[PDB]
Design a protein around this ligand. Structure first.
Ligand SMILES: Nc1nc2c(ncn2[C@@H]2O[C@H](COP(=O)(O)OP(=O)(O)O)[C@@H](O)[C@H]2O)c(=O)[nH]1
Ligand SMILES: Nc1nc2c(ncn2[C@@H]2O[C@H](COP(=O)(O)OP(=O)(O)O)[C@@H](O)[C@H]2O)c(=O)[nH]1
Lengths: 191, 191
């Protein structure tokens, strides 16, 4: 979404979205911890009285070039409990790709559906269509005993059959598979 | 230091500098709390594993214009204990004015002198001269019984006789006088 014509880099924004405490910070921290130090910037936590943000950027060395430009990935999330919907509206500004992180716990299903509809509403207000943008869903907390089946989560949250990944974010299970999937969809859009 | 030609604003950066726990957050919070809501942005706290930052901006209504441009002030500080000198080097990037906040406690005099010399060294590395830049010193914690006299602080920290203010930052004593002094010196440089 942002071209740096001098440093010859395409900057793209990947937003991790989902209900409070679903595992968005965990995904970003795990990715950050496993990313080579020379390819990434700092892990930045931003806080105000009203809102919170967690983000970082990285330039993967493995990737080629799109018309002589290298692609830099910026991973953004609104962590924890959200008190103002404005922060979820702000996080989506200039989004290139979205990872919806669903909390697999039975007690968080209503929250997952509320957040997924909130994502659709906030994207539409900015001229983005959730059915057309690079978008992947992660069924997080697969380790917990109170987790709903993959079939129940698919039926409730993935009617359009978009890429889905089962994860246990603290151990990194499914974390890089979710990231690689949305990043590939973003690169295809850029090409 | 940054001209916004479209919004017709001169943006200037004021850095509060001094040893850890000297009263820099207190100064910024007191100023922020007494600034009219319609003239300021959010009070932003930034944190990484290595460093911390506290900042906000405000456009005072009382001020006139410099060649049809309004002046917006950005107040920046590295709060708390500092683990990496790089954060003190980074905070000074694009600085227009500096407030050195000295902790008046006897046990913090060595820290004040170390920090003041560190400010001089970090400014020189970026091509700034501490003897030429808008710079004011604040003798904070004047309320404490273990406070050194104003004469002892002047002798140890103000050999060049630059503007000095006695403060008790939590009660706001000397806080706006310190700010108005450095801001006036910045405005003269801009004119
Ligand atoms: N059991 C389990 N706990 C998880 C998982 N993902 C995150 N958590 C925990 O859930 C809590 C909230 O997660 P966090 O990443 O901070 O949520 P965020 O608000 O979406 O950023 C923390 O205690 C995490 O360790 C998971 O896959 N399994
Ligand atoms: N007694 C007294 N305490 C102060 C004064 N200024 C700051 N403090 C206290 O010193 C501690 C550290 O101050 P803080 O502003 O957070 O320091 P910073 O690290 O420079 O940002 C806090 O407990 C403050 O309330 C002062 O003028 N007098």
């Amino acid at each position: 979404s942002f071209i740096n014509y001098s440093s010859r880099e395409i900057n793209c924004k990947i937003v991790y979205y989902g209900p409070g405490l679903c595992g968005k910070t965990t995904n970003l921290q795990y990715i950050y911890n496993k990313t080579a130090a020379e390819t990434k910037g700092k892990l930045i936590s931003l806080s105000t009285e009203t809102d919170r943000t967690l983000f970082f950027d990285f330039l993967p060395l493995s990737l080629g070039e799109i018309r002589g430009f290298k692609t830099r990935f910026h991973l953004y999330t609104v962590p924890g409990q959200v008190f103002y919907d404005a922060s979820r509206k702000l996080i989506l500004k200039g989004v290139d790709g979205v990872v919806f992180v669903a909390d697999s716990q039975i007690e968080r299903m209503e929250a997952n559906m509320e957040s997924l509809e909130n994502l659709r509403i906030n994207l539409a207000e900015q001229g983005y269509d959730l059915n057309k943008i690079p978008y992947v869903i992660q069924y997080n907390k697969r380790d917990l005993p109170n987790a709903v089946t993959v079939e129940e989560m698919r039926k409730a949250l993935n009617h359009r059959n978009i890429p889905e990944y089962q994860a246990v974010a603290p151990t990194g299970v499914g974390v890089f598979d979710t990231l690689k999937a949305v990043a590939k969809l973003v690169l295809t859009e850029l090409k």
